[PDB]
Amino acid sequence: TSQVRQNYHQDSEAAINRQINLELYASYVYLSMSYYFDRDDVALKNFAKYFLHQSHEEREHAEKLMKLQNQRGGRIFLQDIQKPDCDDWESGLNAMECALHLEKNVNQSLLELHKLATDKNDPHLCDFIETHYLNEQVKAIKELGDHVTNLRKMGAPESGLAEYLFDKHTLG
Amino acid sequence: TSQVRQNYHQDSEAAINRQINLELYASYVYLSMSYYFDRDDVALKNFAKYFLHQSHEEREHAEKLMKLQNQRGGRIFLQDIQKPDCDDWESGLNAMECALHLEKNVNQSLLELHKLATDKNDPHLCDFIETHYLNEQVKAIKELGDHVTNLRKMGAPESGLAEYLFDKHTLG
Amino acid sequence: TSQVRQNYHQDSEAAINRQINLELYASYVYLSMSYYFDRDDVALKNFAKYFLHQSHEEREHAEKLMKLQNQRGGRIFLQDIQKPDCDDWESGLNAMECALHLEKNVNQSLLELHKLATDKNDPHLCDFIETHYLNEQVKAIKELGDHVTNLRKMGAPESGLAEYLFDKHTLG
């Protein structure tokens, strides 16, 4: 090559393509979690609305990176989007616990990409990550920790009244 | 010094400086209690907002006295602001119980200063205290008593659902 | 540990606790400077309002760091807040000169914390500092330099008319 490409390393380009896939995959997990709470034998409508919004967010995270790639003169190479690992997610608390784990995993990936940009001396990539992904990631993780703590102290998942009230008063 | 000083006793002046410190210290305690409820392993956001507001109030109580001192022609002498005694505050109820104790202690100090003003025949200081601090203090203590009673009757602190609901329905 | 803690070093955590104290201390200095200009034998009301606002700013700087600590999964450990070093601040110019010195000292601390974050490879902490503290610090220092220059060229502190006019036309 592009007439526009400048100080953009191959390794950086490839790592962007992997991140794009990870984010797409995270969107998928969340999509799954959402319609799980919409089942008639589950029926926690605010849980459902919470993971649907999360699902849309993650999609937007990917499309931003797709945009960054073209901007720097790289080429987008897409891969399959894997099946979320679970079909059944058991309870409200369990689902929150799996989302916390998911987000911590996305942050390592992002911490690794940032260390690579640094090594390649790509200050434009470093700030992009720092500015649009890292602060969003710590605020996400703190929020899911808050949620898990509350559910747990209320007595979930053994208490059905506890997930019902949390759905109403916190997620509502 | 002062060209303005009139019927203002040394002892009164010194006692004002001590009160200023006590109020500053109370602000500090409350500041501590607030970020304790903002921890991910605690997470009671309305508890947090309640002690943060309390923290700001106390700061305003000090600055008012700083203002009274200059007005009467005294001189402000500041001292260190001590570490709150606790780092961990254990539960919602415990924290409310410590705040009740704190406020009762601030009121004795104020009752003692008022008795001193009386002894020194300083009617201007007497009304100032009576008007800006004593009624605010009894309304504060009654309110924390109300809170402690409710938390206790709901079954706190052994009940996590109890502090969760109180945070939502009373402090919210 | 916290379920939320990730790539957050002990040393980083401890350094945050020290910064929190420094900022609290800066708030205290400024609080002192303010009621010094409110004395009947000083009486420069805009000087007073200027350091009171500065005082509130610094408090907000601390509370932000308190927030960052919880967010990253660290624990807040508070220490005593030391007596400002001066009780009397002599003149308008002197007070501005002491504030310039204070701010330069806060910036070194912040430059040192940033170098530590870098060493520990904590890109999230690096941007936080860079984004909320370093640019605010250089704009603060430049502004106090401007003020000191003007006071000095007007003929302060030997000229009382000079501090009176500056209070009116610049700080007003």
Next chain:
Amino acid sequence: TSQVRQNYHQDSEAAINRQINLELYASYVYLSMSYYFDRDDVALKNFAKYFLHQSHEEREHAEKLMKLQNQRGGRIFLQDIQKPDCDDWESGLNAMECALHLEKNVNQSLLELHKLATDKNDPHLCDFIETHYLNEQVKAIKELGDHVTNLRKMGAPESGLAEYLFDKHTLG
């Protein structure tokens, strides 16, 4: 008363009549000071407007006491209103210095009346004084101290530019 008189002592009544005279007299002093600054060989129009407003205030202070007297069932006995002691007031600073002295003298009178009410066990008179006169008096004295300090530090009265600027920037 009188069918209305209750727990109102003779001595209290008489002391009210004296206070009424003192306030009337203070109004007169201020009236004099005002037209002194309106002279073509003086001409400090904001000085003039400041003592005219002060003059009206003092008149209102008297009329309030006249009202208190009737309310308690006492009888108003009026006396002559003495000539202010000065015809010429020399300068801006001098006039402010004489007003400070005047106000300190009015406050002693009020402190003495309050001690009398206390001795006679007249809680209604005590609060009346405390509430409508003592806090107004300390705020008055502090303000005139501020003014005297500023005039003095600017170099008045030897500096004509100093009183001119003060009239413009502070009293304006």
